[PDB]
């Protein structure tokens, strides 16, 4: 039962790393391929000079 | 003699204006390259990691 | 990972704040409009770098290569790098760019004012009406005896 709880914790941390990195990468995507959401540029490389 | 020294000063300042104009044109070109380099690093190196 | 997502989300929320910059009408006197913090900080970083560039230019025209000026230049460059990096960490890239656009607009209006002020002097024929050029600056009243011919004799 302890091992089955530890397995659920491990699977939750594995899924949280996956979701955490997908969220992290959403900040780096260019606004042309993203739909109409107000993707205000975060990086200097995303601003039109 | 002061009129001659002032002419030489005018020529030195004129050469420096030419150097600055050329330097600013180069800097404008370098800012454009740095923007493309940063975007290319994000596309080629960062965006693939979620699949792995 | 979570800490990095929070940091980038804070920069995104900071980017969404619209920075109002005040209209540059030239005849409107002194009024109390507060300058945006980004415009002040970008202006001071650009002004520190301008003073550094000017010091390099004045030293290239004055053939007095005084050797004790290199250490002071390295310190001025490190002080600029630290302030510029502080500005890039305190303010959003959008606000820094908009502050630079405003600074470029101000510099373009200063040049146009200088063009209009010199054109009005050429159309007056030689009648010497020495009217009221009023304000500026200097007269450091100290100096000694010397005979200098008041040379605005026509």
From Swiss-Prot, chain A:
Quaternary assembly: Component of the HAUS augmin-like complex. The complex interacts with the gamma-tubulin ring complex and this interaction is required for spindle assembly.
Organism: Xenopus laevis
UniProt record similarity statement: Belongs to the HAUS3 family.
Functional summary from the UniProt entry: Contributes to mitotic spindle assembly, maintenance of centrosome integrity and completion of cytokinesis as part of the HAUS augmin-like complex.
Protein name listed in UniProt: HAUS augmin-like complex subunit 3
Localization per record: Cytoplasm, Cytoskeleton, Microtubule organizing center, Centrosome; Cytoplasm, Cytoskeleton, Spindle
């Amino acid at each position: 039962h302890l091992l089955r709880v530890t397995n659920k914790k491990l699977n939750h941390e594995l899924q949280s790393i996956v979701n955490g990195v997908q969220t992290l990468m959403s900040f780096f995507s260019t606004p042309e391929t993203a739909c109409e959401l107000s993707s205000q540029p975060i990086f200097l490389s995303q601003l039109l000079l | 003699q002061n009129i001659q020294e002032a002419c030489l000063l005018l020529d030195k300042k004129q050469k420096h204006i030419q150097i600055l104009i050329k330097g600013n044109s180069s800097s404008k070109s370098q800012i454009r390259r740095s923007s493309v380099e940063a975007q290319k690093y994000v596309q080629d190196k960062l965006l693939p990691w979620p699949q792995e | 990972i979570q800490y990095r997502c929070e940091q980038l989300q804070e920069i995104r929320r900071a980017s969404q704040r619209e920075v109002m910059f005040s209209a540059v009408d030239p005849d409107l006197s002194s009024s109390t409009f507060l300058e945006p913090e980004v415009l002040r900080d970008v202006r001071e970083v650009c002004k520190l770098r301008f003073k550094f560039l000017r010091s390099l230019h004045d030293d290239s025209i004055s053939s007095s290569v005084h050797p004790g000026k290199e250490d002071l230049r390295s310190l001025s460059h490190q002080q600029w790098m630290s302030m510029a990096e502080k500005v890039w960490n305190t303010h959003t890239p959008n606000h820094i760019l908009a502050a630079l656009e405003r600074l470029t607009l101000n510099s373009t209006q200063e040049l146009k004012k200088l063009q209009f002020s010199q054109a009005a002097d050429l159309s007056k024929g030689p009648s010497c009406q020495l009217k009221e050029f009023s304000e500026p600056i200097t007269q450091s009243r100290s100096c000694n005896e010397s005979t200098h011919l008041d040379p605005q004799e026509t």
